[PDB]
């Protein structure tokens, strides 16, 4: 995972805020249904709830990076 989150990180950099805004609006849904599979009873060998929130977090800061100096 380390190797590709390295990619996935610099990947999402320089990628317009509106699609950063759009991508996360999907990932939060990906988490939403993820909570259900886990809640309904062990339809989740989970370990993903974490690194998906960590994905969602990771994005929102790069959304924020662009929105610091000059958009």
């Amino acid at each position: 995972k380390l190797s590709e989150v390295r990619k996935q990180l610099e990947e999402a950099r320089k990628l317009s805020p509106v699609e950063l805004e759009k991508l996360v609006r999907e990932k939060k849904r990906e988490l939403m249904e993820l909570r259900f599979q886990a809640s309904i009873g062990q339809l989740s060998q989970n370990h993903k709830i974490r690194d998906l929130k960590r994905q969602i977090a990771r994005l929102l800061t790069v959304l924020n990076e662009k929105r610091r100096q000059n958009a």
Binding site: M32, R35, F36, I40, L60
Partner: protein
């Protein structure tokens, strides 16, 4: 980011909730500070389905003394929502 997938948290899983699926009455755990009007739209975009009447209520967690350390379970709010007759929140229809 404030998204509909943040208001609705988990399905309410109990026999009482199941006898609600008879009519269009599906019930979920929501975020405690979420208002009826922002739950309507929360469902409407999270399940592509029309919302007719939202009913909410708060639930205080229970004081549980796990081995002489006594604390409280987090407070939940939940809501039962009327889907326009005919429509079905399909993914919640399992069991």
């Amino acid at each position: 980011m404030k998204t509909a997938y943040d208001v609705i948290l988990a399905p309410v899983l109990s026999e009482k909730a199941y006898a609600g699926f008879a009519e269009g009455k599906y019930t979920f755990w929501v975020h405690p500070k979420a208002t009826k009007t922002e739950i309507k739209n929360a469902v409407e975009t999270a399940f592509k389905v029309k919302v007719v009447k939202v009913n909410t209520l708060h639930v205080r967690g229970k004081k549980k003394r796990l081995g002489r350390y006594l604390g409280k379970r987090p407070d939940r709010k939940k809501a039962i929502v009327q889907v326009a007759p005919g429509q079905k929140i399909e993914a919640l229809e399992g069991l």
